[PDB]
Amino acid sequence: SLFNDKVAKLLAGHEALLMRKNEPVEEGNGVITRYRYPVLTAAHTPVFWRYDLNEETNPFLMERIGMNATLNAGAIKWDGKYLMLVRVEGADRKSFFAVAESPNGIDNFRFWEYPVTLPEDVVPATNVYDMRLTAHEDGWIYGIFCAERHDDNAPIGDLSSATATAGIARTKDLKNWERLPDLKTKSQQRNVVLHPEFVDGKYALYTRPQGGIGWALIDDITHAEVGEEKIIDKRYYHTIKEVKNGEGPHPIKTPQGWLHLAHGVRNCAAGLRYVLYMYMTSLDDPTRLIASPAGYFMAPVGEERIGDVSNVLFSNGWIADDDGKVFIYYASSDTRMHVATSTIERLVDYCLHTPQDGFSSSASVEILKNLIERNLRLMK
Amino acid sequence: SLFNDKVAKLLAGHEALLMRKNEPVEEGNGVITRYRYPVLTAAHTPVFWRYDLNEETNPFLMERIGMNATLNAGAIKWDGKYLMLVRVEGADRKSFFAVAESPNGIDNFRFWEYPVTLPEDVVPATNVYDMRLTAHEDGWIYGIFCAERHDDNAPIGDLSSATATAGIARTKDLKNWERLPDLKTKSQQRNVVLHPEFVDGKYALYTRPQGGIGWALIDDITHAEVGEEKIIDKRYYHTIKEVKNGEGPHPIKTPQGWLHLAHGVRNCAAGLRYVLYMYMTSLDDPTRLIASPAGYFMAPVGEERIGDVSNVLFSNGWIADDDGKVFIYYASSDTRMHVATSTIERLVDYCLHTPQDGFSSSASVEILKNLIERNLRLMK
Amino acid sequence: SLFNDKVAKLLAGHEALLMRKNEPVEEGNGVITRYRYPVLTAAHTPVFWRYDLNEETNPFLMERIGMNATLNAGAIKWDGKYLMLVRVEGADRKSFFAVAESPNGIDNFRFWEYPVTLPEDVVPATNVYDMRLTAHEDGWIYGIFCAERHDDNAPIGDLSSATATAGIARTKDLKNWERLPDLKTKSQQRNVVLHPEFVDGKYALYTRPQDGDTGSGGGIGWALIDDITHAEVGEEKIIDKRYYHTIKEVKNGEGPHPIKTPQGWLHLAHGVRNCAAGLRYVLYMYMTSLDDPTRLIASPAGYFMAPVGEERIGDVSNVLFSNGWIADDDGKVFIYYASSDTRMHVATSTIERLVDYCLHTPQDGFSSSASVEILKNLIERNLRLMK
Amino acid sequence: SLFNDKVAKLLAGHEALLMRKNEPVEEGNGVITRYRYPVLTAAHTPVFWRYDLNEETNPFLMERIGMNATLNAGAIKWDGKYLMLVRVEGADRKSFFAVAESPNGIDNFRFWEYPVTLPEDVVPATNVYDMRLTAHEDGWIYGIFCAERHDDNAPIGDLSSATATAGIARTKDLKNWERLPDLKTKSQQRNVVLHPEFVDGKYALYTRPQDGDTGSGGGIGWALIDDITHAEVGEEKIIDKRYYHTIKEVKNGEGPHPIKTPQGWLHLAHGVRNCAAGLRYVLYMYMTSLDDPTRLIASPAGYFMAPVGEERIGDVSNVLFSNGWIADDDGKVFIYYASSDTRMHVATSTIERLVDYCLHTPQDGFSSSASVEILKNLIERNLRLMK
Amino acid sequence: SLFNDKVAKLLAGHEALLMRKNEPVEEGNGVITRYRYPVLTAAHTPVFWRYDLNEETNPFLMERIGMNATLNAGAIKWDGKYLMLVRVEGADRKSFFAVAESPNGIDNFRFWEYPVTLPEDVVPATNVYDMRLTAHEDGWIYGIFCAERHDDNAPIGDLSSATATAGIARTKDLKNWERLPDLKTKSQQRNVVLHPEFVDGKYALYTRPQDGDTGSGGGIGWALIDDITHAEVGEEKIIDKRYYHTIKEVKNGEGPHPIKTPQGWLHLAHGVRNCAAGLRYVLYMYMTSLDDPTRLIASPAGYFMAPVGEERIGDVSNVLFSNGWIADDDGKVFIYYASSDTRMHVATSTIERLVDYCLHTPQDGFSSSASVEILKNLIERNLRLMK
Ligand SMILES: O=P(O)(O)O[C@H]1O[C@H](CO)[C@@H](O)[C@H](O)[C@@H]1O
Ligand SMILES: O=P(O)(O)O[C@H]1O[C@H](CO)[C@@H](O)[C@H](O)[C@@H]1O
Ligand SMILES: O=P(O)(O)O[C@H]1O[C@H](CO)[C@@H](O)[C@H](O)[C@@H]1O
Ligand SMILES: O=P(O)(O)O[C@H]1O[C@H](CO)[C@@H](O)[C@H](O)[C@@H]1O
C-alpha cells in the first residue's frame, strides 16, 4: 500500500541518517579536530516520536509532535558506550531531556526509545535545560540542570520575565531519576555543575551567581544550600568572557590539574556572542587557577554560526577515555550538537603554552612579535 | 553594439530567472511542502524598474534605482491567476506595494509593469507595508496595511521612534485604489486584517492593540473606528508567541471552522525570533477558539534563516483553490518570498490532531510518551 | 558488535538506495522524459546476493560474489506491478536473468530474492541474455533470449569465437520456467522476439538473420512458426531494412515486442553503425499496419534516443539498448533501456506522443541536401509564425 | 495558454544559453588558453530548427527534427565578426553546413536563421563535411570539404563501404554558393585545404592522399592546380610525414589553412594513432617557409592539444579535430576545435606564442632514450637556475 | 616582477597538489579500499620537467616538454619509503621510466628530480614500458620491461607494426642501471616478470608467449633460466590459462611479481576481452603453491578489480592495469594500478583479506547455470541466517 510504503521510507531514510559515518575535518589548528557532520539534529529524533504511524488515526502521515532542536547536551561514558544527555526542544518551545548513545563517540548516536521522565520538585518548573552529568564518588550519577519558571513579580503583560533555580536529580541507570530539592541560594544561580570528588568531605559545586564562575561547598546534596562562595574564574573587560561566563561540563582530572571547559559571552551589534574557553585549577586546591590561556578555545565556524540563536557555541558535556582521547560535545547556535576530538595531553599543552592575555592591544602585539622573532630565526 | 548586447543580456537573464520551474522539496513533515526556490526576490523586479535603458542617459548601464527586498506579500486569487501584493523595499529603505502574478501559484511570478499607486490619507505616511487583501462580500477588495510615521513626541536626535496606523484602501481592479480614512483607535494597532464576511451586519477586523490577537466590529469601513475589542488568541509564557503575535492573512473558511495563519514572536540572545502558527475558530462564533495546536506551524529552515532581519518567517497572504489546494506565501528574514503548499484537509488535520500545549516540559514529555507507546505497540 | 553493526549499515544503505525517489529531467525534447537516476545498477542487487552475512565464514565481511552490471531488461506489467526481467552480469562475466519489481515503474525496483532458474535445452549454453517477454494470447508468458556457446570449430587459441541460438522458455508465474527447443534456423539468429498475437493462426517471430558479422543480413525479419514447441524458421520476410549512412547502417534489431495502438503496431528497435571508437548503438522507432504487421506505415528519420550524459560511459560505451517497455491502460508508456551495457534507465512518454513522433518526424530522404530541404521547410513555417 | 507559455520558455532558455559568457580556464600550459564552455553544441541550434512552433500541427510541442552534434567547423573573420562554418549533424545522421557568428570569438555564437544551401556537383553526395574556408587572393571565399558517397562496388549487405571526393564550392556572401567540379585525383583525397596565395601563379592545395585505409599514404601533401574550376591533382609532394610511435603514426591531415607569419606559414593539423579503444585523434603544429611553402622549418615534438576532461567523451570519443581558426590583426588567435565529433570549443593564443611554441619545443628524436636526454638537459638548466 | 610571480605560483600550486592528503572511499566491497585521488597524474611531474624557468629563453613561460600520462608503475619498498617505478608518457608519445617516492604509500608521491637513465641493449628500442621490479635473492633489483621496436618487415606505409622483447636491467640504487641482454625467445614475449627466488637453483620468469595477436598463446607461463645475464627461454609451462567467456578470454598477463604468503604465492594479473568498444582490461588474482610455484591452488572466479567511475575514462578507456604492489611486514598491502593508461591509483588491503578473497570467492563453473547455482546456494544460507 502507498501508506505502508511511505512509512517504510521514513524509517529507512532515518536509519541512513543515523548510521552515516562522520569524517574529521583535516584543516584544523592542531588543538581540536572538528567533524563534517553534527552528531545530533532535530532530524535525528526517532520517527516514532514525531509521526503517528497508524494509518487509521494519521492517514496523511504528518508529524504530530514537531521537534525543533537538539542542543546543550551533558555527556557520560556509560557501560562502554558514549552517551549524551540531550536537551531536546520541541516545536512547542519546551525542552526536555533525552539520552542518546553511540558505540564510538563521533557518530551513530541514537536516542533511547523513551526520553527522560524527570519528576518535579515541590515547585513545578516550566522549562528544564542544560543538564551536567557527574558520576560522583558517592556512587550516584547527578544531573544538575536549570529549572525555569515565570517571574511572579513581573508587571502584567510581561510574559517573558523568568526566574531559574539549579535543579538536582540523581540516578543509577539514567532511566529512573530521583528529584532532590532545588539548590537553595540567596543569589540566582545558573550553570551549576557538581565536582566529582568530595572536598573537605563535602560536595562541591561550580556556580554562577547572578563576578564569574564560583565554587561552593555543600554539606548535604539532598538538602543543598549555598553558603560561602569563592570566585575561581573571573570576567574581564574586552575578553571573550566580558559580560557573562559559566562552567560547561565538570572538569577532567589530569596529572597536571583539573582541566576546565567553560563558555564566555560578550555583547556585539548582533546580540550576545558565546564562545568556549578553557582554564586549569590545582589538584591540591581546586579553587586555585594554574592555567589561563588567552582568548577562546573554540568559536563558531561555518555552519555553526547560524541557527535559532546564532553566534553561539555552548558545551555542557565531554568524555575522556582511559587512553587520553577526549570527545567534546558542543552545541552550535542552540540548534544542533557537534563533536570535536582532542587528547588530554594536547588540551593540557594548549592550556599551559598558549600565552596568557596581557589585556591590551600593545601586550598582544608584544607576545606576537616574540613568537614571530623565534620563528623567523628558525626558518632562516 | 556593445551596449545593446548588454541590454539584451540583462533582459534575457531576467526572463530565464522569471520562468524557472520550481520544484517541491521532497523531505517534509507531511503537513506542508516547501519549494526549492523563492517565488520572489529583489532580482525578480523588472529590469526596467532598476536600469535606465537609454544609452544616451545611462552609457555605463548601471542601476538607477536599487531594489533591496520583496517580502510580506498579501495574496488573492484573481481572474484565474495567483496574485501577490508584494511589499517591495528599495535600496532607499522605503517600501511600496506592487502586484505580481503567476499562472500556477508556485513559479513564474512576474510583476505588473507599474507598482501600486496608493493615495495618502489626510496625514501623509513615510512607510507603508504588509498589506492584507480581503475580497469582502460587499464587492470590494480591501487592502489593510501598516502606515508608519515618525513619532512627533520623540526627543531631539531620536530619528527612530515611530507611530503606526492601520491604513485602509479598497479597489476593484488592483490598479485604482481609493484610500479610506486610517483606522481610528485608542491603542496603537498593527497586523490589522479584514474578515471577509459581515458579522452581525458589521465589518469585522482582526487587531493587535499595543494581550494578543483581537476582534473588533466596525459599523462603517469608510469611517472605521474601533470600539469594543475581544481577544481571540492569547500570548503565553514560554511558547512561540510569548512577546508578540499577530494575524497573518485573513482566515480560510472550512466546513470545520475558520482556519487561521498567524505569527508569534519571542526574544532570544540574537534578537526577536518570528515563526508561523495556526489556530481555528468557530463558524457560529468566529471569536471562539476551537483548535490550538501546540507550537509552530513553520519556522525558518536553511536559506530562510538568513537575511536583512534574520530568524524570521512572516505571512500575510495565502490562496485556497476550489479543489482544496492551499498556496501559502511567506517571507523569510524580511528579504524574499517563498511558497509552501498544502490542502485544507491536511491543514485542518494538523490543527485538530497536533496535541495542545500543556505549557511545561513535564506535560510535553507525557504527550510524547503517549505517542511513543502507541507507536511501539504498533511496530511490534 | 562491530561486525553486526557493519551488516546493519550495509542493509540500511541498501534500503536507502532502493527507496530513492526518481525525478524527471525537466530538459527534454517533448517526446520522451528522462529521469535523474538509473532504475537499476549492480549496486541494486541484494546485499545477500553479494556478501556472506555469517561472521563465522566471512569475518572480514567481504563480497563473495561480485555483481558487475544490470542491463538489457525485458519488461511486463504483472499483477499490478511493473516488472523487469533483468540481465544481470556477475564479476565472473556470466549473465543470468532475474526479476525485479516496482510499484510505480520509475523507482523502488527491487529484485526478487532469488534470480531466474532457467533449465538448459538439450545443448547447454555458456551465456544467456537479453530476454524479451511476450504475454501471448495462448496464455503463456514467453521469454525469447540469446543462448550463446563457444564455437568449437575455431582455430587453436581462439577462445572468443561464438555461436548463438534463440532460446525459448515459457512460464505462467515467472518462477517456474519450461525450456522449449532452441529455434531452428539456417542463419544465425539474434534479437528474436515473439509477436503477441497469432497471425494466420501461427506464431510470429521478429528475427534478425545474419551470416555470423551481419553480412547479407537485410534487417529485422518476420517469420511465421506453426508450433512454438518445435519452432523452426522457414520463410522469413524483411520488415525494417538497414540503410547506408543512417543510424541503422551496420546492424539493427527489434527491441521489445511492439505495442498495439489504434494506428498500428508501435515498434522500438536499436540501430548500429561503426565509428572510430567502435560500434555505436542508438534506439529508433517504426510502425507497421494492423491489417498486415509486415507492412511499414511509419519510418521517422534518425534516432529516437541516443546516449546522453552518464549514458555515454560504461563497460561498452556509446550504447543504448532496449528489450522491454510497458504501456498502461491510460496510455502512459515506460521505456526500459540500458546504457553502455552497464545500467538500466527508464524514460516515459505516452502512446499518443510516440505515435505523433512516428507519424510527424519527417522521413529520411537519405542525403544532406534532402535533410537541408526538410529543415528549410520547417524554418520557413516557423519564421512566418513568429512574425 | 499553457502551450504559448511552453514556447516562451523554450525561447527564453535558448537565449540564456546563447548569451552565456565564457570564462577562460586559468590552469593551462602557457601556450593555449582553454575555456569553461563549448562555443557550440547541438543545443545551440535554433529552437525553430528543431520544433514546429504551431500548436495546430504540433500540439504536444515535440521536436520534429532532432539535432545531434555541432562539430568540425571552418572559420573566417567576416565583416568584423567571428564566423564558424559549422558541420551540423542531425539525428538522421546526415551532416550539413551552417554559418554561426559571434561578436567576440569566444561566446555568443548564434546560427544564421537558415543553414547552408550547397548545390550538388554532377554526382550527388550522401554526406558532406569538414569545410575549410579560404579567403583566396582571387577574391573568392572557397570552401573545400569532403563529399561522401556509398561505394556501389561493395559485397552484398555492405552498406558501410564509402568513397569520398574533395568538394569545391565558392562564395562571396556565405549564402549563395557556387559548386565547382569535385577535385579529380588518382588517390582518394580527404582533408584537402586551399592555400590562400597563388604559388607560381597556380592554386595550391594541401592534400592527404590514401589508398582507401591510408596504406601507402605518406602524409600531408602539396599539389599545384592550374584552374580551380577544373581542379585535378597531377604531381603532389609530401610536406609533413607520418612517423612510427608519434602522435601522427596511422594518419594525419591538415586542419584549417595555415596562418602567414613573418617567420613562415603556421600550420595546425591532426594526427591519428591506433590504441585498444580505437583511433585517437590529437592536434599538432608545424611551420613551413615563406620562400618555399613546401619546406618544413619547424617540427615541435608531440601534440599541441589532446582531449582534456569533457573533451574526452562524445559520439566518437578520444578525438580532437580542427578545421578553422582566426588570427586578428593584433596577433590574437582563436582556435576552433571539435571534441569527440560532438561539440565545438575555442582555445586562445597569439601568433607570437604559437611561433614560440613551434620554434622552441624540442624536435622529436624518435626514441625513449632521446626523449630522456632532451628532458635531462632542461632539468639540468632549471636546477642550476633554481639554485 | 610579473614573470617571477608566475613562476612562484606554478611552484606553489604544484606543491599543494603534491602534498594533498588522500582519503579512502568508504563505499567498498570489503576486499579492497579505493582512494579519492590518483597517486600520480601527468600534472604531478615536476614543474621543472615541463617549463623552462628562465625568463631570457622562455619569456611567455610556456611548457617546453609536455607530459601526457603517468601509468603502469612498478613498485618496491625502498629504504623505508614507498616507491613507484613510473611509466611516464610524454606529449611526444614516448614513454620513459621515473622513480617517485612517498613516505606513506597513499599520497605525497614525488618524482626524483631526474628520471631513469636506461642504457640501450645492442639493438636500440623506440619505446620502453611497464617495468616490474624484483628484489631478487641474488642481491640485485631487476627491472623487467617491454622494449618495443618498429617491425622493419612491414608493408610500405605501415608505420604501426611493431615487435617487442623483454628488456632486462638491474640496479642496486635505482639510479645506475646495467642493461643485460634482451630475453631470447622463439615466441614474442610481453608481461615478463622475475620471480624473486631461485627455483631449482635457477632464475624463474613469468612469461606471456604469443604469436604476434595472441593466437596460440595459452596464458601466463613459467620459464626457468640458467643465467639472467644471458637469458633465454627454453621450456615454458603455462600456469594460468585463458578461458572462453571469462574476464581473461582474449589475453592475460602477470602484473607485479607475486607476494609470498604462508598459504602460497599471491598473484595479481590482468585479463582482456573484446567488446563493441574495443579491448577491456580488468585485474584478477590467483594463487600458486609454495612447494611448486607452477601449481595453481586458488582461482577465484571473475575480476578482482574493474574500472570504476573516473577510472573508466582516459587515453585508452575501459582499462585497469597493475605491475606494482607493496606488502609491509604488518600485512598491509598497497596495490598500485593504472586506469585507462592515463593515471596511477592506489588501493589498499591486507595479505589476510586478499588470501581470504582468493580462497573463498567461489571458482568459476564457466556457465550461467553454474553461476546461478553458486548464487542460489549463498542466498539460501543468508536467508536462513537473516530469519
Ligand atoms: O546562562 P548562559 O550561560 O547565559 O547560557 C544561556 O544562553 C545560551 C545561549 O543562548 C543557551 O545556550 C543556554 O541554554 C543558556 O540559556
Ligand atoms: O508587527 P510585527 O508583528 O512585530 O511584525 C514586524 O516585524 C516583522 C519582523 O521584522 C516584519 O516582517 C514586519 O513587517 C513587521 O515590521
Ligand atoms: O545483437 P546486437 O544487436 O548486435 O546487440 C549486441 O550488442 C549490444 C551492445 O553491446 C549488447 O547490448 C547486446 O546484448 C548484444 O550483445
Ligand atoms: O579523415 P580523418 O583525418 O581520418 O578524419 C576523420 O575522422 C575524424 C574523427 O572521427 C572526424 O572528425 C573527421 O570528420 C573525419 O571523418
Ligand SMILES: O=P(O)(O)O[C@H]1O[C@H](CO)[C@@H](O)[C@H](O)[C@@H]1O
Ligand atoms: O600486453 P598487454 O597485456 O596486452 O597490455 C598492453 O595493453 C595495455 C592496455 O592498453 C597497456 O596498458 C599495456 O602497456 C600494454 O600495452
